[PDB]
Structure 1
Amino acid sequence: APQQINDIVHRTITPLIEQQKIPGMAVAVIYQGKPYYFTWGYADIAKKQPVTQQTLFELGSVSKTFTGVLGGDAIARGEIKLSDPTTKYWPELTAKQWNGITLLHLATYTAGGLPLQVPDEVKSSSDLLRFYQNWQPAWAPGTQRLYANSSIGLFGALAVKPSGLSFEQAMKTRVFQPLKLNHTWINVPSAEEKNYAWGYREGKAVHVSPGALDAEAYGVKSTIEDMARWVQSNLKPLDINEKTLQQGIQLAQSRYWQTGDMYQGLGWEMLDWPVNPDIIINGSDNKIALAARPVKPITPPTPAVRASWVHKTGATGGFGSYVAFIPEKELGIVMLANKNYPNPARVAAAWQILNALQ
């Protein structure tokens, strides 16, 4: 790595790890299109297993970027349209509040108040039907953004229905395999458990529990190498040979709604670059990021803007992840940690690194 990259990374990440008491961490900087890797600490504290470039971290809600791109690929294949009604893909969803709720609304958290989580009690498709049939919206569709695993989770499950594939099989065949993400998993194979870091919550080793729509909203595990490749693919989709996947990557960075200075993509969120760092840092705090916010539609959606800060946070009980990139600058960062530490500290560190390298 160029000394300027080593310098800024060690100057930024070393005190972050000390301040947040992070047990293990992996970072990739993508600089002029090439990846540079850094690792610290332990994937398993008690067993003294170091983090390596093959360590699997739980991505939590960063998984939604894969879901958004898979949905964009289905659009590009002609299999779905974002204007399609939800009920086109789930005709059993008959309750009257679903009239007018489209795939766009599900994908972008604008259906009208779908809740942050699918309830833990919901486990089968019959439970899931009852949940969505009994849900009562707080707002008309397309008026308020309320970040929700139950919203984009349902989008992902329905987006793959025309293909005839399960969500997991669609993701493997249409996204992971073409991009050579050979160590990215919705379900970690038995033979890969030795590479799966433990997460740490209040000092206790933990892994994410199964839940309905987990794969779609928060369930992917990946290595720092595969995540660097994922950033490269989203930075420069023109190098992707599979045309519908290239197009799906582009569509996930289209701007569908604006609230404040942020724009909602498919999974990804975007702001115009240069950003105000306080806006992205403070906006990442759960107090703002999980709050309902009024949206303005963008009709037609703005095609992906190269001079954007494109990013996504994610957490599980034991992990904290962050990805951010600037297509115009060919510049990106992935930060994976096996402790869920506050979002603003992730965003502040990422901006400090990328701003120094721009």
Structure 2
Amino acid sequence: APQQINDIVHRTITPLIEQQKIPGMAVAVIYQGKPYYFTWGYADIAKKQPVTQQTLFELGSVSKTFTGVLGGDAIARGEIKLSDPTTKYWPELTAKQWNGITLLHLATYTAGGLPLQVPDEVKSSSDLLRFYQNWQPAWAPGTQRLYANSSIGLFGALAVKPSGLSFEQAMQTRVFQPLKLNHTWINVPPAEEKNYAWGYREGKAVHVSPGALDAEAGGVKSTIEDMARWVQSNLKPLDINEKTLQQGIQLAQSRYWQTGDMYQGLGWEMLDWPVNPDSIIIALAARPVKAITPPTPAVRASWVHKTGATGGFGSYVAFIPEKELGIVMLANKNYPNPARVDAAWQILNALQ
């Protein structure tokens, strides 16, 4: 590895790991299009298993980038449109508040105040229908953003309905397989359990226990190598051979809404590059949005990023298409987002 990369990465991450008491971490830097891998510490503290380039981490909400691109591929296939009403794909959603809520609104958290979490009481499909029918929006569609798993999670479930595939089958066949992400999973198979790191919350070993729509909103587990390849694919979507997947990547990096300095994509979030690091960086935050009419196609001069967490894991991905530069940070503790972004900016700034 080039010494410049070696030095900035170790000099940034070692102190981060110490300060945040992170049990294990894997980092990939993509520099001039090529990946460089770094690992520290433990996938499993009790069994003394190290983090390796084959270790699986829970991505948490970084999974929304995969859901956004799968939705994007479905649009490119002519299976769905973001301008379509939600009721087109769920005819049993007859409650009047749904008039005017489109797939776009669901995908971008702008439906009018769908909650962060689907209630734990919702187990059955009829429980799920009841939840969305009974939900009362605070706001008109397309006026305020409230980050929500019940919003993008429903988009993911509906986006695959025309295909007739399960969400997992669609993701596997249409996104993971074409991009050769052969160690990326929504459900970790028994063959791969040996490599599934434990998450750590207040010292306790924990794995995600998915409720309704958690697969769609936060369900991906992946290795540092596959995540580097995911960044490579999002950096250069035009090198991807599957035409609908190529367009799908581009659609997920389009700017649909603006709030302050941030632009909402499908899963992905973006800021103009160069960004101030203060601007890149709370349980519920309702923010008015301006519609970008029509959406701006993927801007090469962007900082494109997404944070992700589960009870036991914290992930971050960021890239700058213009510079062919990117980073993935995977950890088996959920530590504060600003620490993630600060470390990522330190590394990418140094290498830009």
The TM-score range, normalised by the shorter chain, is over 0.9
Alpha-carbon shift at residue 141 of structure 1 (Å) = 0.3
CA deviations 1:274-321 (Å, max 9, x no partner) are 00100112xxxxxx6840100000111000000000000000000000
Alpha-carbon shift at residue 148 of structure 1 (Å) = 0.1
Matches of 1:251 and 1:10, distance apart in 2: 35
Q: Does 1:337 align with 2:334?
A: no
Matches of 2:22 and 2:173, distance apart in 1: 34
Q: Secondary structure at the match of 2:306?
A: strand
Matches of 1:227 and 1:338, distance apart in 2: 15
Matches of 2:62 and 2:210, distance apart in 1: 17
Q: Secondary structure at the match of 1:184?
A: coil
Structure 1 residues 36 and 289, CA gap change in structure 2 (3 angstroms): farther
Q: Does 1:196 align with 2:175?
A: no
Matches of 1:123 and 1:235, distance apart in 2: 38
Matches of 2:284 and 2:185, distance apart in 1: 26
Matches of 1:170 and 1:290, distance apart in 2: 31
2:245 maps to what in 1?
245
Is the contact made by 1:56 and 1:223 (CA closer than 8 Å) also made in structure 2?
yes
Matches of 1:230 and 1:290, distance apart in 2: 29
Matches of 2:162 and 2:284, distance apart in 1: 31
RMSD between superposed Cα atoms in Å: 0.7
Alpha-carbon shift at residue 124 of structure 1 (Å) = 1.6
Alpha-carbon shift at residue 24 of structure 1 (Å) = 0.2
TM-score (norm. length: structure 1): 0.98
What number of residue pairs does the alignment pair up? Answer: 352
Matches of 1:325 and 1:290, distance apart in 2: 26
Structure 1, unaligned runs of 5 or more: 282-287
1:257 maps to what in 2?
257
1:171 maps to what in 2?
171
Q: Secondary structure at the match of 1:162?
A: coil
Is the contact made by 1:147 and 1:289 (CA closer than 8 Å) also made in structure 2?
no
Matches of 2:223 and 2:231, distance apart in 1: 12
Summarize the alignment of residues 82-101 of structure 1 with structure 2, pairs less than 5 Å apart. 82-101=82-101
2:78 maps to what in 1?
78
CA deviations 1:155-174 (Å, max 9, x no partner) are 00000111111111000000
Structure 1 residues 2 and 290, CA gap change in structure 2 (3 angstroms): farther
Matches of 1:123 and 1:64, distance apart in 2: 21
Alpha-carbon shift at residue 47 of structure 1 (Å) = 0.7
Structure 2, unaligned runs of 5 or more: none
Alpha-carbon shift at residue 123 of structure 1 (Å) = 1.4
Q: Secondary structure at the match of 1:36?
A: strand
Matches of 2:256 and 2:132, distance apart in 1: 24
Is the contact made by 1:231 and 1:332 (CA closer than 8 Å) also made in structure 2?
yes
CA deviations 1:119-160 (Å, max 9, x no partner) are 111112111100000000000000000000000000000001
Alpha-carbon shift at residue 26 of structure 1 (Å) = 0.1
Runs of 4+, deviation exceeding 2 Å: none
Matches of 1:240 and 1:191, distance apart in 2: 29
Alpha-carbon shift at residue 191 of structure 1 (Å) = 1.3
Q: Secondary structure at the match of 2:292?
A: strand
Is the contact made by 1:257 and 1:264 (CA closer than 8 Å) also made in structure 2?
yes
Matches of 1:6 and 1:123, distance apart in 2: 47
Aligned identity (percent) is: 98
Matches of 1:50 and 1:124, distance apart in 2: 39
Summarize the alignment of residues 217-236 of structure 1 with structure 2, pairs less than 5 Å apart. 217-236=217-236
Is the contact made by 1:269 and 1:312 (CA closer than 8 Å) also made in structure 2?
yes
Matches of 2:73 and 2:294, distance apart in 1: 18
Matches of 1:308 and 1:26, distance apart in 2: 24
Matches of 1:136 and 1:69, distance apart in 2: 29
